[PDB]
């Protein structure tokens, strides 16, 4: 009959937290395609994105 | 030639029974847009074929002969794109029925009729 | 997709403009989030009335490149160079004249002004980027090798149950050119019938 | 203008894919409803007085 709740600087940690695995993956994918447009290739981009 | 699209918009919404509303207004705007589209797509070829060193009357014939296929291509593509709004029933289907019949009736008469007619309006010799 | 496959009669080429259809409406979703316009039924209404107006500038350029590859035996790498230099003034023209039917409707007030919006912006953004997706990439991906040189069977009989389709089609073009010749022959009743149909309109 | 892309197709494919997955992640961050704010704004004052 007694609930618990979060306030203050921790309250956002209750909502959608660190999206760092998302932003890393999308940010590596967009640069992988951007320098592919620079190179006019696909496998030569791999040699500099790894 | 925008009357030659809105006459079919009018007769389609009359024989369907749906009345004039905001959807009929945006339908007549888009049907005069597509009427202008499939008219200028051959009148520009008639213009360049005349102004490359030909007369006005043979250039229109050569342009419509060379361009009849993409006109009917765009027309049948559009009509099969906007038929599933007219044939659908269910949730929110009244707005789809109001927006579909006007554009199908405008488009079929902008296609099947004006292809004879924008050459006749182009070869008006007062446009010299 | 399948009706333009029935027109083009080539499975390796008919997906060339229908991969141009998912690249644009998602792009219009790039515009609405840039303008705060939320997804409603009117935006989807605009897109389903705009997909027929959408792929036209791509089907005319693939029609021109297959025409210049059927009439002349050129490779597509230079056939695209010959085509896009001669039809550059039309595919931008239909988009610029189709944007202008929906630009002045967005500035009107009232409760019908906001319902005229989401019928304006989702079409003018589409036709604003349909012209660039028509001029930037589909000549390139039609020009690589995706239209191979196919001679011998130029569609005069073409075989199969679909082989009489173009056989009826060029006969209809012959009837059409004979009809427009008879139209420009007399031209006397063909203005009074225009006056009586606008008077009926 | 063209002629910069028929010789460079990967640039065109990258532009296509970046506008695709620029819209495709942006669909997941805007709301969906049936209709926009079609109704006019209205303010209502209200009192109750028993008896």
């Amino acid at each position: 009959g007694v609930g618990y709740s979060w306030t203050g600087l921790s309250y956002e940690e209750r909502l959608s937290g660190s999206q760092a695995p998302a932003l890393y993956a999308l940010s590596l994918l967009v640069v992988f395609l951007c320098l592919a447009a620079l190179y006019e290739s696909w496998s030569i981009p791999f040699s500099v994105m790894l | 030639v925008v009357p030659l699209g809105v006459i079919g918009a009018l007769l389609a919404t009359s024989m369907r029974g749906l009345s004039n509303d905001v959807f009929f207004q945006v339908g007549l705007l888009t049907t005069i847009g597509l009427s202008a589209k499939n008219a200028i797509l051959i009148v520009e070829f008639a213009k360049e074929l005349h102004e490359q060193g030909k007369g006005i009357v043979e250039a229109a014939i050569e342009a419509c002969r060379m361009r009849l296929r993409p006109i009917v291509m765009t027309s049948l593509a559009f009509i099969l794109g906007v038929v599933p709004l007219a044939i659908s029933t269910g949730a929110g289907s009244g707005s789809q029925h109001a927006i579909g019949t006007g554009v199908i009736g405008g488009m079929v008469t902008a296609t099947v009729l004006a292809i004879f007619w924008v050459p006749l309006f182009y070869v008006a010799v007062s446009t010299l | 997709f399948l009706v333009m496959y029935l027109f083009l009669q080539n499975f390796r080429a008919t997906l060339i403009p229908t991969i141009a259809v998912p690249v644009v409406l998602l792009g219009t979703f790039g515009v609405l989030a840039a303008f705060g316009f939320s997804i409603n039924t009117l935006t989807m209404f605009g897109m389903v009335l705009a997909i027929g107006l959408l792929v036209d500038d791509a089907i005319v350029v693939v029609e021109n490149v297959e025409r210049v590859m059927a009439e002349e035996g050129l490779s597509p790498r230079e056939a695209a160079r010959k085509s896009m230099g001669q039809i550059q003034g039309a595919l931008v023209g239909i988009a610029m004249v189709l944007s202008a039917v929906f630009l002045p409707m967005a500035f009107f007030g009232g409760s019908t002004g906001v319902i005229y919006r989401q019928f304006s912006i989702t079409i003018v953004s589409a036709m604003a980027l349909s012209v660039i997706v028509a001029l930037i990439l589909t000549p390139a991906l039609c020009a690589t090798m995706l239209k191979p040189i196919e001679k011998g069977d130029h569609g005069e009989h073409k075989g199969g149950f679909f082989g009489w389709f173009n056989r009826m089609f060029l006969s209809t073009t012959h009837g059409y050119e004979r009809g427009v010749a008879s139209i420009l022959k007399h031209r006397a009743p063909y203005l009074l019938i225009y006056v009586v149909i606008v008077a009926g309109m | 203008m063209s002629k910069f892309f028929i010789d460079r197709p990967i640039f065109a494919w990258v532009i296509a894919l970046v506008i695709m997955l620029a819209g495709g992640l942006s669909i997941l961050s805007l709301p969906v409803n049936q209709y926009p704010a079609i109704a006019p704004p209205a303010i209502a004052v209200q009192v109750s007085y028993p008896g």
Side-chain angles (χ1 to χ4, degrees), chain C residues 20-176:
Chain C
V21 75
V23 307
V24 47
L25 84 166
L26 265 75
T28 64
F29 288 126
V31 179
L32 306 173
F35 279 163
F37 279 76
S38 175
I39 292 182
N40 44 74
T41 73
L42 275 82
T43 61
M44 330 306 291
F45 276 4
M47 287 183 284
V48 300
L49 66 90
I51 54 169
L53 300 173
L54 181 60
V55 298
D56 55 356
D57 43 1
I59 66 162
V60 297
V61 70
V62 69
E63 166 63 38
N64 206 39
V65 76
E66 69 92 19
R67 197 258 314 157
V68 73
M69 286 182 65
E71 191 262 328
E72 280 167 352
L74 274 301
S75 177
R77 199 255 175 194
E78 64 264 20
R81 293 161 158 272
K82 206 260 181 184
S83 68
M84 73 185 182
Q86 78 188 359
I87 61 171
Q88 206 192 3
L91 81 174
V92 66
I94 58 171
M96 196 275 286
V97 78
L98 183 46
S99 309
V101 309
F102 296 140
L103 259 71
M105 85 188 295
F107 290 157
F108 280 125
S111 164
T112 184
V114 71
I115 205 166
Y116 281 166
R117 301 181 195 88
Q118 310 104 30
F119 274 159
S120 54
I121 184 64
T122 189
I123 314 302
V124 303
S125 65
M127 304 289 107
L129 77 97
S130 180
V131 59
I132 70 170
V133 77
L135 66 88
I136 206 166
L137 57 90
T138 169
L141 51 87
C142 87
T144 50
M145 207 52 230
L146 269 298
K147 276 82 195 174
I149 294 96
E150 304 303 311
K151 300 307 145 208
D153 199 4
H154 318 269
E156 53 269 0
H157 53 272
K158 201 175 69 68
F161 287 149
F162 300 143
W164 62 274
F165 180 65
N166 52 4
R167 207 173 318 152
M168 193 256 298
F169 189 73
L170 90 160
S171 71
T172 54
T173 66
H174 280 303
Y176 171 74

Side-chain angles (χ1 to χ4, degrees), chain B residues 2 14 24 30 38 44 48 53 56 60 64 69 75 79-80 85 98-99:
Chain B
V2 307
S14 70
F24 181 74
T30 189
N38 65 351
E44 67 93 9
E48 61 95 15
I56 51 170
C64 69
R69 161 176 276 268
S75 305
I79 206 73
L80 273 305
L85 281 86
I99 199 49

Side-chain angles (χ1 to χ4, degrees), chain B residues 97-112:
Chain B
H97 287 178
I99 199 49
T101 72
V103 303
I104 71 181
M107 202 289 306
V108 299
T109 192
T111 293
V112 82

